[PDB]
Design an enzyme around this catalytic site. Structure first.
Site, PDB file in Angstrom:
ATOM      1  N   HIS A 111      25.796   4.290 -24.288  1.00 22.24           N
ATOM      2  CA  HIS A 111      24.894   4.890 -23.316  1.00 22.24           C
ATOM      3  C   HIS A 111      23.770   3.877 -23.047  1.00 22.24           C
ATOM      4  CE1 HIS A 111      26.721   8.958 -23.878  1.00 22.24           C
ATOM      5  NE2 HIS A 111      26.569   8.752 -25.174  1.00 22.24           N
TER       6      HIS A 111
ATOM      7  N   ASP B 146      18.371   4.184 -17.098  1.00 21.51           N
ATOM      8  CA  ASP B 146      17.991   3.537 -15.834  1.00 21.51           C
ATOM      9  C   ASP B 146      16.783   4.351 -15.349  1.00 21.51           C
ATOM     10  OD1 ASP B 146      17.541   3.020 -12.992  1.00 21.51           O
ATOM     11  OD2 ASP B 146      19.653   3.322 -12.517  1.00 21.51           O
TER      12      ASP B 146
ATOM     13  N   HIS C 279      14.244   4.977 -12.561  1.00 15.70           N
ATOM     14  CA  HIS C 279      13.890   4.656 -11.172  1.00 15.70           C
ATOM     15  C   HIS C 279      12.420   4.252 -11.051  1.00 15.70           C
ATOM     16  CE1 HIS C 279      17.277   7.223  -9.016  1.00 15.70           C
ATOM     17  NE2 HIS C 279      17.778   6.317  -9.816  1.00 15.70           N
TER      18      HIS C 279
ATOM     19  N   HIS D 209      18.101   8.169 -15.591  1.00 13.38           N
ATOM     20  CA  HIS D 209      19.444   8.599 -15.916  1.00 13.38           C
ATOM     21  C   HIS D 209      20.255   7.542 -16.662  1.00 13.38           C
ATOM     22  CE1 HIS D 209      21.588   6.316 -12.639  1.00 13.38           C
ATOM     23  NE2 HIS D 209      20.535   6.607 -11.914  1.00 13.38           N
ATOM     24  N   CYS D 210      21.283   8.011 -17.369  1.00  9.24           N
ATOM     25  CA  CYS D 210      22.197   7.068 -18.010  1.00  9.24           C
ATOM     26  C   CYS D 210      23.021   6.396 -16.912  1.00  9.24           C
ATOM     27  CB  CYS D 210      23.077   7.783 -19.030  1.00  9.24           C
ATOM     28  SG  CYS D 210      24.114   6.669 -20.002  1.00  9.24           S
TER      29      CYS D 210
ATOM     30  N   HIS E 290      28.620  10.144 -16.749  1.00 11.28           N
ATOM     31  CA  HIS E 290      27.483  10.421 -17.620  1.00 11.28           C
ATOM     32  C   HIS E 290      26.362  11.188 -16.933  1.00 11.28           C
ATOM     33  CE1 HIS E 290      28.303   7.572 -21.180  1.00 11.28           C
ATOM     34  NE2 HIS E 290      29.420   7.720 -20.494  1.00 11.28           N
TER      35      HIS E 290
ATOM     36  N   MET F 285      23.091  13.638 -18.246  1.00 14.65           N
ATOM     37  CA  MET F 285      22.111  12.608 -18.591  1.00 14.65           C
ATOM     38  C   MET F 285      21.090  12.217 -17.534  1.00 14.65           C
ATOM     39  SD  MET F 285      24.327  10.358 -21.321  1.00 14.65           S
ATOM     40  CE  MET F 285      22.881  10.125 -22.387  1.00 14.65           C
TER      41      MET F 285
ATOM     42  N   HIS G  19      13.111  26.538  -2.683  1.00 10.62           N
ATOM     43  CA  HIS G  19      12.396  27.594  -2.018  1.00 10.62           C
ATOM     44  C   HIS G  19      11.937  28.655  -3.036  1.00 10.62           C
ATOM     45  CE1 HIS G  19      12.635  31.757  -0.118  1.00 10.62           C
ATOM     46  NE2 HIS G  19      11.881  31.167   0.766  1.00 10.62           N
TER      47      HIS G  19
ATOM     48  N   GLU H  87       8.183  26.394   3.744  1.00  8.64           N
ATOM     49  CA  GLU H  87       8.981  27.510   3.252  1.00  8.64           C
ATOM     50  C   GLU H  87      10.016  26.971   2.262  1.00  8.64           C
ATOM     51  OE1 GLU H  87      11.421  29.395   6.529  1.00  8.64           O
ATOM     52  OE2 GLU H  87      10.895  27.595   7.605  1.00  8.64           O
ATOM     53  N   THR H  88      10.639  25.851   2.632  1.00  9.61           N
ATOM     54  CA  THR H  88      11.742  25.254   1.900  1.00  9.61           C
ATOM     55  C   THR H  88      11.622  23.731   1.982  1.00  9.61           C
ATOM     56  OG1 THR H  88      13.275  27.109   2.380  1.00  9.61           O
ATOM     57  CG2 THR H  88      14.337  25.089   1.858  1.00  9.61           C
TER      58      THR H  88
ATOM     59  N   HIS I 218      18.041  26.938  -1.461  1.00 13.94           N
ATOM     60  CA  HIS I 218      18.288  27.830  -0.340  1.00 13.94           C
ATOM     61  C   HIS I 218      19.555  27.544   0.443  1.00 13.94           C
ATOM     62  CE1 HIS I 218      17.411  30.884   2.719  1.00 13.94           C
ATOM     63  NE2 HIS I 218      16.350  31.212   2.029  1.00 13.94           N
TER      64      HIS I 218
HETATM   65 CU   LIG Z   1      25.479   7.939 -21.106  1.00 12.30          CU
HETATM   66 CU   LIG Z   2      15.055  33.082   2.025  1.00 13.45          CU
HETATM   67 CU   LIG Z   3      19.763   5.783 -10.049  1.00 13.15          CU
END
Ligand SMILES: [Cu+2]
Ligand SMILES: [Cu+2]
Ligand SMILES: [Cu+2]
Ligand SMILES: [Cu+2]
Ligand SMILES: [Cu+2]
Ligand SMILES: [Cu+2]
Lengths: 333, 333, 333
Positions: C88, C91, C93, C128-129, C138, C143, C248, C272-273, C299
């Site tokens: 494993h 990463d 971001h 994330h892995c 993964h 992950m 939402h 709203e969303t 939603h």
């Molecule tokens: Cu992994």
């Molecule tokens: Cu709704």
């Molecule tokens: Cu990425």
């Protein structure tokens, strides 16, 4: 008149490069003349030999990027050789009126036509073929590219400061719908017309079989990587004429991004992942700070790593230990 | 009190029109009273006779657009005739508290209820039915529409300038999940309840069979096109209560767009294609500059041209040769 | 040096809580040390007993949220016990260079490694892995988590005013691809490795079987609801490392939202969303004005109610009749 103005010709270059152009310009409106020839052909789109009965502007996927300044007039001569089998046209999202140009450019095999339109709005815009009764098919088969209309005094940040790039690269992302046989093997067709009925069946599921950058799996990887240097600023133009995508640079960011692609609006900064709406082109700026290999991909990771939508950027320079540093290499617990 | 204030009644009109209203208003808060009757019915949703066991607010898809100003109180009387078979309710995304109104409006066939809520936030908001244990089914069957809450002094651009529209049109985009038989023919059901089990199976695939504007394929095309004149400014309200969509106007643009739909935020300009998140309503302004037929559609082009999500706008006026001009009609190479 | 600076240790807490931290800080850059242990296990992901051969950071889905201020250095010790079977890595971001840390943290079962990176950009970022040749697997197996980098002087509105929250909650949304047998029953596998081939077949369809918040259907409902009081301000962090989602709050709104998740950009209000791009984390602020049960969901309502992506917030306080009021309870017409 919109005609009287100086006329100049541009020589189009293949993706992922963009033809030479100036960012800011001290110069008035001109008529920029471009020529595009349609090319129908069967292309190999993966590393296992799968084929596509494809349709292109200028022989590549995506078509070449055309760049002008806000205020110019675009004068396109569209040619459709007698060796092709289908009628074609163009629809510029950057243009106003008659279905984006589509009504004035219907060109059968052996014909040509010339359209002129004013590029009065700033940004990256998609252009695509759109013949009545078969638009989805021609688009999905490869007929799209970008038009970039630069603000006459170049790109700016939210507070108005000037923003410059050292190089520009153009990436076209294509969702492809290649039918499969009973075997579980992709079909190969002798003619373009023969591919049609099966392809529309696969399209209606809404599930692409392959999603590629610039025409094939691996187009932009390994030996075909994009190249840059640390301290260099790159403009990454990304178009998707039919389906959403969410670009991301592993190990980098979008320093300044116009995800809806229109330069009159302020850009967003420090984005990990941005979003390009199907039917549009967006743009991101980044300055490399660390050397090494970077991956540029669609961050639905199944779409990137299983279906094909991933590329590489190879960056030269000196490591910077303050940004990142391995304090303890992998070892036994 | 929020009660003492003047009370006024509005007479609701069917899509794609919007009931008369003022943009800016010199006037204080009022209680706007509206009445909606639920109507369950089987509707023909395509040109080949496919049917849907549908559920509506006021007999149409989408339900009518309700328009008030920021600060007003909405007073809705929801009626569910004895001829219907299912319980229904409403959930206003523009409201605050008790599941948007859903907990206070549970209405069985033969009952009615009256809810009042303060519309203290500006924008276009989705409203939809949401009965416990079966929300997706009622929404997908047609129970949604928009509430538009205008800023008391009208719509503004990013720098604060006033923005006006001459007419407003309301479009509801519906993703539909109509089961298919072994034949490969769409099923027809005698009652609403009978459609249920199969429909939920199709829903779970996440692949609509049809995606339509306002209730059917071709609702807004040919003879049913929207109409406008060059120099006229139109407000295009677009709602999608369950699934994303990416509206685009072929040959036009979104001059000013609120893709998330909330008027207190600055709009973006010159958009080719915008994005409405499933569960929301957005709004775009455009001024026609060229006459002719325009298409308004979802720019996943397979969704627009194969599945149904496309409409027409027919525009009267004089061609402008400076914007666009055919210099050389199609001819032999 | 980036080293000399004070070093401090943080004790990580399980979702949906976030470890104690300060919003604004009068204090300079520091090296924040965190430790994460990878844990492979079979988990029950629904109420019907379906199982997943899962892979986690610290035993939960999502991994814990790590919070630092803009300018700090993150120092992570990644440990991969000898009881696991696969290699494993991580990463981030939020980091710059070597595939986000992935190249410097490749850790086989029985190994550990320590990485340090400068967190020079503000926002919520996904981590994330990402092991070469098997990243999608993964990630989809569990992950991922979030890194939140706060501006040193806290969160601000568009005009620069200070924004505060009373509590923060972290939600990880996971699209899961559990194979089905001929029966129509979900498969159960004895080992992680055995699940692999079938899982990649389901992934390639792009249709999840289940979409859950924090590891299972109902993780955040009924007795496990999130809790708040009226007048309290909550920060809802939402991450999705592979697939888009559209959060939402039923009966509420996003008062201030960073849907792309990066704090240097102005937030949008009254949404709203909102929309979180696959591969990113976003953040929304809300202040409760009405007591009662609220639902927080994706939603696309089929994804929320059929596939699992929905949760509850239980709010204490006094009803406010001016915001909403039942004038006429349900009764006979
Ligand atoms: Cu992994
Ligand atoms: Cu709704
Ligand atoms: Cu990425
Ligand atoms: Cu064509
Ligand atoms: Cu188009
Ligand atoms: Cu209902």
């Amino acid at each position: 008149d919109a005609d009287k103005l100086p006329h100049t010709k541009v020589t189009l270059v293949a993706p992922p490069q963009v033809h030479p152009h100036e960012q800011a310009t001290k110069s008035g409106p001109k008529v920029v003349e471009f020529t595009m020839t349609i090319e129908e052909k069967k292309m190999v789109i993966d590393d296992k030999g799968t084929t596509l009965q494809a349709m292109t502007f200028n022989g590549s996927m995506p078509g070449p990027t055309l760049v002008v300044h806000e205020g110019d007039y675009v004068q396109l001569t569209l040619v459709n050789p007698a060796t092709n089998a289908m009628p074609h046209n163009v629809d510029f999202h950057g243009a106003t009126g008659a279905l984006g140009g589509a009504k004035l450019t219907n060109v059968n095999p052996g014909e040509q036509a010339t359209l002129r339109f004013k590029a009065d709005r700033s940004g990256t815009f998609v252009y695509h073929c759109a013949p009545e009764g078969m638009v989805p098919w021609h688009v999905v088969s490869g007929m799209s590219g970008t038009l970039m209309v630069l603000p006459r005094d170049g790109l700016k940040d939210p507070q108005g400061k000037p923003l410059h790039y050292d190089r520009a690269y153009t990436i076209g992302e294509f969702d492809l719908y290649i039918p499969k046989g009973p075997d579980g093997k992709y079909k190969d067709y002798a003619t373009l017309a023969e591919s049609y009925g099966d392809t529309v069946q696969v399209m209606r599921t809404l599930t692409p079989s392959h999603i590629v950058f610039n025409g094939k799996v691996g187009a932009l990887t390994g030996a075909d990587a994009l190249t840059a240097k640390v301290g260099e600023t790159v403009l990454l133009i990304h178009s998707q004429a039919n389906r959403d995508t969410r670009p991301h640079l592993i190990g980098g960011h979008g320093d300044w991004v116009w995800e809806t692609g229109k330069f009159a609006n302020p850009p967003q900064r420090d984005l990990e992942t941005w979003f390009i709406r199907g039917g549009s082109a967006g743009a991101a700026l980044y300055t490399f700070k660390q050397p090494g290999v970077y991956a540029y991909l669609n961050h639905n990771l199944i779409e990137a790593f299983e279906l094909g939508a991933a590329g590489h950027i190879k960056v030269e320079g000196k490591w910077n230990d303050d940004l990142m540093k391995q304090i303890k290499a992998p070892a036994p617990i």
